[PDB]
């Protein structure tokens, strides 16, 4: 029994595919970017991309095409999951509520059929007559496109050729006709088949099988004016037709393989081409005319336009704008100019979108000496390589810290109408008021004339027309910028005390307990206006001139005491509109209004910390959407702030939250602060652009961070990092990198660009002499990286043809020094595997990288961990436990041996080990008997491992090539000379993500138990946690209910998606709860929410809170 809960802490950032077309509106341009499982939907603008709709799916997208048949208005979408899920999508707006529909769907796999090289190829014919699929090796799948076929019934046709490389449909062919590059013992060839769907046959294509090159890897079909097939290999480009053939081998393209393409002009004149280098080519075909038939071709030449992130996906948009989909680096928006600049680049970067890319390796490191952890992932590859420092929450830059206990408010102020650098600030004190004027950065408490300092201030804002306002318990006083005394004054015509207050430039609304008054400010005098009484006692008010008026405010709204409500009203007339009745038993503490780009928002905060969101129109004055969140458990004070262009909302609480803007939505995320009571914007000539803060005691000021939950740094390495270690006693990261170099004319290698190891601040190479007995070679490095600066303190280069595989930072035995230990291997392309290698013990000093001790090994050092003052390495297949003499030298002790290829290791504290390559996992014990290994138990399934972590003394988490997670634990039954020997698979699961690395740590803190983060190839960062017996049984069930209520996108069963899947079996998943689906609850309509709960107890609006305490593990 192994109860587990996985969560997506960060969505996959790798673009896996993208397309253009009119999917939103027949007169709209759309960018359709598929991630792994996500599907971003954009519309193109003068700026670039307007986000529109982002949805997940239950599957890895592998095919994504837009198509528009006859008798259809706008383009429809066709998606095919890697688990062979076909489905046809459509975008459908009901005015303001946006929906993606399922027009067709089915499952298009067969029991028979090896999946082939290059994997899935899906293609639609130009006439929309069908959908052709090469799912399987040797067959071709047809989905005959009809008005019927809502379940996409598909017939297969036999293929004589069982190795296809690429296939397209050809324009201008009588029937539907395919075109492809196949392989056989003679080499590579081109062939066409006419696909008649009447007879379910393949007939014969419009032109005879010709011959393409022994590296051909792309068929590009060409549109109506031309017709034909452009075929791309290495070092050559061919154009094929009836008997027309054209070819060119431009030395430029030879250098690296053209990987992805794309048509720029509809008439198929200009095409874009991607490389492993990131080079952006322009394929141009020359128009030739005989003038009475159509148009032929004279030639076709290729020009190098510039440089992109290693393009996996490619799409031209409106005007020059090219979206570059990267997998190994940050995707980006790129402009094609007509003119070159410096270095001859017709390419100009517009925007660069953060891809956390191939996460090869990472670790959890504080770097702030708090309790929270930053994560530092080795991301990217080749020129795109980088470290990413991922920091959870928005943080504060502090400047001054004055110790004042019992502050009650603060508002922006100036003592000169000229400078907008607010040189003053007045705070509310414990029934008192003290002045704070600034000599600059000097905190000065004096008296100010016309301001009372023994009463308690309620408001103190910037009333324009030369005046300073001070509403307090009794009177609302007034000061000017000409005399500075009692310029005017207002008093309640009874001697009753004012309670609630709201004020802007030339407008004031107060409350005397149910009583209301509206004021005005002009030159020098305080003039009163209208008055109305109200149902109960006023708890809060708000007034502010919005985006439709200059200093004066149109409509209005409040919330009062007894009924516990939120009232919509008018201002001068004081009439009552459509209030929103609220539940609860505590007052509403704060109420506000805001404006961003497009929309107006009415927010109300409660006393027990909760918050409700509604939309008050500047015109209509009507309701909007309802939902409940938790913040802290204290009252929440709502303020407005200046940041960038989008100026936003700060929620003060015991758990401080900020409200930015995402796409049109309002962000809602944590703020790294002790506890925050009251807050305001600033801009003094001692602290500009600052935000002011107060709590129990102590003021703070200083600029605010970014937006979002996850902050991302990025330290561009320009090469490719393999693993990372954190020596904290040293205050620096050790990172293994790798650069590719080219054979040169003399006999050595050089470099292609300035990398991290080359332009390193200080370097050293290896001197060991232990070995004897069109060319690219990887060069490897340890890098020393300052944790504060992230500069390259040092870069050590390893030997020739030596790769550095593994890294540890530890103290070994009674050696007081901490070390860097690097496992390595010697690689040359004859041997299938290494039969050599090293183990180097590096020591970093004041600022010096010392080679302390080396050791030879007859095989690759795959991983290694600090066991117990002893070093535990895996050497190709022997797993050996080294110890550390006083000699300062690695001496052997024991070494197991029952492995195929020991790729990974993890240590459970005391004396326990794990992990293999193509035969699942093992479990070992070190015996302080004679320092001898004893194989405790092993998993007997045939998994192709990729990642291993020990969760606890029994739960072992493994990840594997087929994107599946599993969990092992030892059988606790009798007859333990056999049943002990096997450890059973107590939990399977389909993440749908290649897992590179696991480790312990959390991105938060100063309901569950444990915490294990993982990084994946697609850049997704996950979180595994272990569960308590009851919490599972509830969650698995409420997970089962959610399937019935949530309408799947491609109409895909969630339980199917989550099922364990290798080529040779499929099981439904046990012991695994994706909180992703659990988190799906909090974004449900209340009607479909009540459904989930029909049935120790079961509530309704109590689970809404349990799913809260979950979205707080990351």
């Amino acid at each position: 029994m192994s109860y587990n809960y996985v969560v997506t802490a960060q969505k996959p950032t790798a673009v896996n595919g993208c397309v253009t077309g009119h999917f939103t509106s027949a007169e709209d341009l759309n960018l359709l970017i598929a991630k792994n499982t996500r599907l971003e939907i954009y519309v193109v603008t003068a700026e670039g991309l307007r986000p529109v709709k982002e949805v997940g799916m239950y599957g890895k997208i592998a095919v994504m095409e837009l198509f528009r048949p006859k008798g259809e208005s706008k383009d429809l979408l066709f998606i095919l999951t890697a688990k062979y899920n076909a489905c046809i999508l459509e975008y459908k707006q009901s005015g303001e509520s946006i929906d993606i529909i399922t027009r067709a769907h089915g499952n298009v796999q067969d029991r028979i059929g090896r999946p082939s090289e290059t994997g899935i190829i899906g293609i639609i014919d130009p006439e929309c007559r069908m959908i052709g699929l090469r799912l399987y090796d040797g067959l071709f799948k047809v989905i005959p496109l009809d008005r019927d076929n809502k379940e996409l019934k598909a017939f297969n046709i036999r293929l004589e050729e069982l190795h296809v490389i690429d296939v397209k449909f050809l324009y201008g062919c009588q029937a539907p006709t395919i075109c492809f590059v196949y392989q056989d013992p003679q080499g590579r060839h081109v062939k066409t088949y006419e696909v008649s769907l009447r007879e379910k046959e393949f007939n014969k294509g419009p032109w005879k099988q010709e011959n393409v090159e022994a590296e051909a890897s792309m068929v590009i079909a060409v549109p109506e004016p031309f017709g034909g097939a452009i075929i791309i290999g290495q070092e050559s480009i061919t154009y094929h037709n009836g008997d027309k053939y054209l070819a060119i081998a431009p030395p430029i393209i030879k250098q690296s393989t053209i990987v992805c393409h794309n048509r720029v002009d509809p008439n198929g004149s200009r095409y874009l081409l991607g490389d492993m280098e990131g080079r952006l080519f322009m394929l141009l075909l020359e128009k030739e005319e005989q003038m009475d038939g159509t148009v032929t071709l004279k030639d076709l030449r290729v020009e190098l336009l510039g440089e992109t992130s290693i393009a996996e996906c490619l799409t031209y948009l409106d005007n020059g704008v090219v979206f570059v989909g990267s997998r190994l680096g940050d995707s980006q928006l790129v402009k094609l100019n007509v003119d070159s600049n410096e270095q001859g680049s017709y390419v100009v970067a517009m925007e660069t979108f953060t891809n956390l890319g191939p996460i090869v390796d990472m670790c959890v490191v504080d770097l702030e000496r708090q309790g929270q952890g930053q994560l530092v992932t080795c991301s990217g590859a080749f020129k795109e390589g980088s470290l990413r420092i991922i920091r959870n929450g928005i943080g504060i830059h502090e400047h001054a810290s004055i110790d004042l206990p019992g502050i009650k408010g603060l508002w922006p102020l100036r003592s000169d109408p000229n400078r907008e650098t607010y040189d003053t600030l007045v705070l509310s004190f414990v029934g008192q008021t003290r002045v704070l004027m600034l000599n600059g950065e000097e905190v000065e408490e004096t008296e100010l004339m016309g301001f009372v300092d023994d009463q308690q201030t309620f408001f103190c804002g910037n009333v324009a027309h030369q005046q300073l306002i001070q509403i307090t318990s009794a009177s609302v006083r007034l000061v000017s910028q000409e005399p500075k005394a009692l310029v005017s004054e207002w008093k309640e015509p009874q001697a009753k005390n004012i309670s609630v207050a709201s004020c802007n430039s030339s407008q004031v609304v107060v409350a005397v307990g149910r009583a209301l008054y509206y004021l005005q400010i002009h030159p020098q005098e305080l003039r009163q206006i209208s008055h109305t009484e109200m149902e109960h006692e006023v708890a809060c008010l708000d007034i502010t001139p919005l985006g439709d008026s200059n200093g004066l405010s149109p409509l209005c709204a409040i919330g009062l005491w007894t009924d516990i409500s939120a009232r919509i009203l008018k201002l001068p007339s004081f009439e009552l509109l459509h209030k929103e009745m609220l539940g609860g038993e505590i007052i509403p503490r704060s109420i506000l209004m805001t404006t961003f780009e497009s929309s107006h928002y009415l927010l109300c905060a409660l006393g027990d910390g909760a918050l409700f969101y509604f939309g008050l129109n500047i015109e209509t004055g009507l309701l909007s959407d309802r939902k409940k969140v938790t913040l802290g458990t204290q009252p929440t004070v709502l303020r407005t702030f200046r940041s960038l262009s989008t100026t936003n909302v700060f929620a003060c609480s015991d758990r401080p939250t900020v409200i930015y803007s995402s796409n049109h939505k309002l962000v809602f995320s944590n703020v790294n602060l002790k506890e925050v009571n009251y807050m305001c914007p600033l801009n003094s000539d001692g602290y500009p652009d600052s935000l002011a803060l107060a709590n129990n005691s102590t003021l703070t000021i200083g600029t605010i961070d970014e937006i979002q939950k996850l902050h991302i740094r990025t330290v561009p390495l320009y090469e490719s990092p393999r693993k990372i270690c954190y020596q904290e006693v040293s205050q620096c990261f050790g990172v293994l990198s790798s650069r590719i170099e080219v054979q040169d004319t003399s006999g050595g290698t050089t470099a292609l660009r300035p990398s991290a190891s080359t332009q390193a601040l200080s370097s050293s190479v290896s001197s060991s002499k232990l070995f004897s007995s069109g060319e690219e070679v990887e060069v490897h490095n340890l890098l020393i990286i300052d944790q504060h600066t992230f500069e390259v303190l040092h870069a050590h280069q390893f030997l020739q043809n030596e790769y550095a595989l593994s890294l540890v930072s530890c103290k070994l035995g009674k050696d007081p020094n901490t070390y860097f230990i690097v496992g390595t291997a010697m690689v040359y392309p004859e041997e299938a595997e290494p039969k050599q290698g090293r183990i180097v013990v590096f020591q970093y000093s004041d600022g010096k990288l010392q080679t302390v001790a080396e050791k030879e090994v007859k095989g690759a050092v795959y991983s290694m961990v600090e066991f117990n003052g002893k070093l535990l390495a895996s050497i190709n297949s022997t797993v050996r436990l080294y110890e550390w003499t006083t000699e300062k030298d690695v001496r052997t002790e024991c070494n197991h041996y029952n492995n195929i290829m020991a790729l990974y290791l993890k240590t459970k504290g005391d004396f326990i080990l794990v992990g293999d390559l193509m035969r699942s996992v093992l479990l070992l014990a070190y015996k302080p008997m004679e320092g001898n290994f004893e194989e405790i138990a092993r998993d007997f399934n045939p998994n192709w491992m990729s990642a291993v972590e020990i969760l606890d003394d029994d739960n072992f988490l493994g990840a594997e090539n087929a994107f599946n997670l599993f969990v092992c634990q030892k059988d606790s039954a009798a007859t333990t000379d056999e049943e002990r020997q096997h450890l059973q698979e107590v939990g399977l699961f389909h993440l749908g993500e290649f897992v590179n690395v696991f480790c312990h740590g959390s991105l938060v803190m100063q309901p569950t138990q444990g915490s294990v983060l993982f990084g994946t190839v697609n850049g997704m960062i996950g979180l595994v946690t272990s569960l308590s017996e009851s919490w599972y049984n509830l969650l698995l069930d409420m997970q089962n209910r959610l399937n019935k209520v949530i309408k799947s996108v491609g109409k895909i069963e969630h339980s199917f998606w989550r099922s364990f899947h290798t080529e040779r079996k499929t099981e439904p998943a046990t012991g695994f709860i994706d909180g992703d689906l659990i988190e799906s609850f909090l974004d449900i309509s209340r009607p479909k929410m009540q459904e989930v709960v029909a049935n120790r107890e079961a509530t309704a609006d109590d689970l809404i809170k349990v799913v809260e305490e979950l979205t707080r593990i990351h």
Binding site: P358, R722, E778, V827, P829, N961, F994, V1017
Partner: peptide, 13 residues
């Protein structure tokens, strides 16, 4: 080889 495979399995095909 075994390693030319292992710096490509950490990246994807």
């Amino acid at each position: 080889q075994a390693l030319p495979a292992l710096r490509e399995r950490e990246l994807g095909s």
